[PDB]
Amino acid sequence: VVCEVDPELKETLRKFRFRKETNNAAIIMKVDKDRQMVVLEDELQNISPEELKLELPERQPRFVVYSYKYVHDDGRVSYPLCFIFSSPVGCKPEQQMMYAGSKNRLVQTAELTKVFEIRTTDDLTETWLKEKLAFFR
């Protein structure tokens, strides 16, 4: 069963993509099993990678869209929009797979091309993120 993206979430994501703010911000999303929908859990502003990490459940999956201010060594700035599938190894397989099966639809909805996955929340570090993003540099 593939979850639909909640229409309200699609709107949240659309507005977020085109935000004109230049701080780091995140949208965290979860599955509503009963509705078979991906829904908004939290929208957070001025959130660093470590703070984001600390928001994520350690043993349940989440989807994240993270708008990160990437400061190049010379001081140029980019604002990549990242998808992070947090799929901790301690989650039940059924729950992992429920999220995994809905990931692509969500990514497509959000029109995201930078799609990452972590298998423990500990792996969400700024270093990891920057290295991931540098592939698109």
UniProtKB/Swiss-Prot annotation:
A single BP term in Gene Ontology: negative regulation of Arp2/3 complex-mediated actin nucleation
GO molecular function per UniProt: actin binding; Arp2/3 complex binding; growth factor activity
Pfam families the UniProt entry points to: Cofilin_ADF
Keywords, sorted A to Z: Acetylation, Growth factor
Gene3D superfamilies linked to this entry: Severin
Keyword Nucleotide-binding: no
Keyword Acetylation: yes
Domain ADF-H as annotated: residue spans: 1-134
SUPFAM superfamilies, alphabetized: Actin depolymerizing proteins
Disulfide bonds: none
Lineage: superkingdom: Eukaryota
Protein family: Belongs to the actin-binding proteins ADF family. GMF subfamily.
Name of the protein in its database record: Glia maturation factor gamma
Naturally occurring in which organism (per UniProt): Mus musculus
